[PDB]
Design a protein around this nucleic acid. Structure first.
Ligand SMILES: [Zn+2]
Length: 252
DNA sequence: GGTAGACCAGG
DNA sequence: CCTGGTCTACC
């Protein structure tokens, strides 16, 4: 899921688990657990803790318990559901948190690509994978000024910059391409080649792209199709070693 | 320190 | 062999 879908998950999942006390944690694919390294330590420390909150940082979900925070990344196919302990698990269920009321928070992931880290709450923000994560795109912490400062420093293309998670949280290939199209900027442009005007415009489009979604594509996956704003065929190349979609007319 | 890109597994 | 987000590991 993209950031906005993750936010939707955070919102709808919270009431379904808040106030629930963990009685057991069952792990069927240990590699998902990245911290503590030993999945057994992971399971044992969570038992007895009550879910108190659920926050989002970038595309990470941060489950708040009594003492610990669980940092969860769904990656490609990860999904959470709350269901009865009495019913059969759905296919590809790799982690289950069992609550004392007989319900369960289940993590499914056909790809097995998702990750989980647990730390004492007060440590979560200064350890991987949250450490160094850039500002929320919809926060005043993410500003044209912040953006401009990073652009000037680097020899990187603008796309490479926006894909950098220390720059801003939750911007993947899709939103980068879309934001760059909406800002009229070619992805292969050097980040340092962007004018202050282009920086402002880009920041604005980024925020709008994320903001609107947290509530139709122009270029992503539309190569060979007419651009929706000028009709020029959308093209696809490789920038920052990535599948990059752009309009050769709208973007400069 | 700044950077590209290596890798979680399976469709 | 391919996707990708991002933490790692290259110099
Ligand atoms: Zn166009």
């Amino acid at each position: 899921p993209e950031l906005p879908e993750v936010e939707t998950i955070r919102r709808t999942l919270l009431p379904l688990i808040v106030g629930k006390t963990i009685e057991d944690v069952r792990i069927f694919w240990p590699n998902i657990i990245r911290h503590p390294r030993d999945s057994e330590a992971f399971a044992a420390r969570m038992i007895g803790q009550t879910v108190r909150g659920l926050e989002r940082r970038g595309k990470f979900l941060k489950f708040l318990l009594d003492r610990d925070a669980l940092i969860s990344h769904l990656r490609m196919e990860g999904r959470y559901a709350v269901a009865s302990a009495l019913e059969p698990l759905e296919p590809h269920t790799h982690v289950v948190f069992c609550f004392t009321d007989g319900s369960e928070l289940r993590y499914r992931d056909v790809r097995k690509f998702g990750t989980m880290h647990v730390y004492a709450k007060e440590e979560a923000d200064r350890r991987p994978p949250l450490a160094e994560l850039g500002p929320e795109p919809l926060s005043p912490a993410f500003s044209p000024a912040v953006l401009a400062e990073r652009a000037v420093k680097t020899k990187r293309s603008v796309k490479a910059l926006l894909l950098d998670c220390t720059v801003v949280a939750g911007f993947g290939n899709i939103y980068v391409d879309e934001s760059l199209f909406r800002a009229g900027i070619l992805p292969g442009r050097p980040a340092a080649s962007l004018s202050s005007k282009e920086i402002e415009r880009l920041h604005e489009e980024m925020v709008a792209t994320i903001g609107e979604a947290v509530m139709h594509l122009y270029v992503y996956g539309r190569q060979g199709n007419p651009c929706k704003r000028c009709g020029t065929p959308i093209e696809k190349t490789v920038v920052a070693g990535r599948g990059t979609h752009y309009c050769p007319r709208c973007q400069r």
